[PDB]
């Protein structure tokens, strides 16, 4: 509350560390469905169904230009990519499986880096 603060967690390396995590997601072999925005002209249904499209390139641009106020807003966009994938793709598809694998991979790096 006013003039009463918990001790200051050092957040000065968060930008650099989220960048490294993102690099590792970008270079994973199962990243291919997630590297670029889904083409909304060419994928019937995507525009109407997926209210908030997100992909690694868009996260990368937001990160590079100071559009994440903190590390949690960054994690929310990453998770949004996998949540969208689950909403549109059958679990037993290459893209559905890619999504489950990438989410697992991300959540481990996230815990190991920050928890």
UniProtKB/Swiss-Prot annotation:
Q: Would you say which domain of life the source belongs to?
A: Eukaryota
**Places the protein is found:** Nucleus
Specify the Bromo domain's residue ranges.
9-113
Expression tissues: Expressed at varying levels in several tissues, whereas a smaller transcript was expressed specifically in testis.
Q: How does it assemble?
A: Component of the BRF-1 ISWI chromatin remodeling complex, at least composed of SMARCA1 and BAZ2B, which regulates the spacing of histone octamers on the DNA template to facilitate access to DNA. Within the BRF-1 ISWI chromatin remodeling complex interacts with SMARCA1; the interaction is direct. Component of the BRF-5 ISWI chromatin remodeling complex, at least composed of SMARCA5/SNF2H and BAZ2B, which regulates the spacing of histone octamers on the DNA template to facilitate access to DNA.
Q: Which family does it belong to?
A: Belongs to the WAL family.
Please give the function described in this protein's UniProt entry: Regulatory subunit of the ATP-dependent BRF-1 and BRF-5 ISWI chromatin remodeling complexes, which form ordered nucleosome arrays on chromatin and facilitate access to DNA during DNA-templated processes such as DNA replication, transcription, and repair. Both complexes regulate the spacing of nucleosomes along the chromatin and have the ability to slide mononucleosomes to the center of a DNA template. The BRF-1 ISWI chromatin remodeling complex has a lower ATP hydrolysis rate than the BRF-5 ISWI chromatin remodeling complex.
The entry's protein name is Bromodomain adjacent to zinc finger domain protein 2B
Species = Homo sapiens
Q: Which residues of the full protein are shown?
A: 2054 to 2166 of 2168
């Amino acid at each position: 509350s006013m003039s009463v603060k918990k001790p200051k967690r050092d957040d000065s390396k968060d930008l650099a560390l989220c960048s490294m995590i993102l690099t590792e997601m970008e270079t994973h072999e199962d990243a291919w469905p997630f590297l670029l925005p889904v083409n909304l002209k060419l994928v019937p249904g995507y525009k109407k169904v997926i209210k908030k499209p997100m992909d690694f390139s868009t996260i990368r641009e937001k990160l590079s230009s100071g559009q994440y106020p903190n590390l949690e807003t960054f994690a929310l966009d990453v998770r949004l990519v996998f949540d969208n994938c689950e909403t549109f793709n059958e679990d037993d598809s290459d893209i559905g499986r890619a999504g489950h694998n990438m989410r697992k991979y991300f959540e481990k790096k996230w815990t190991d880096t920050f928890k």
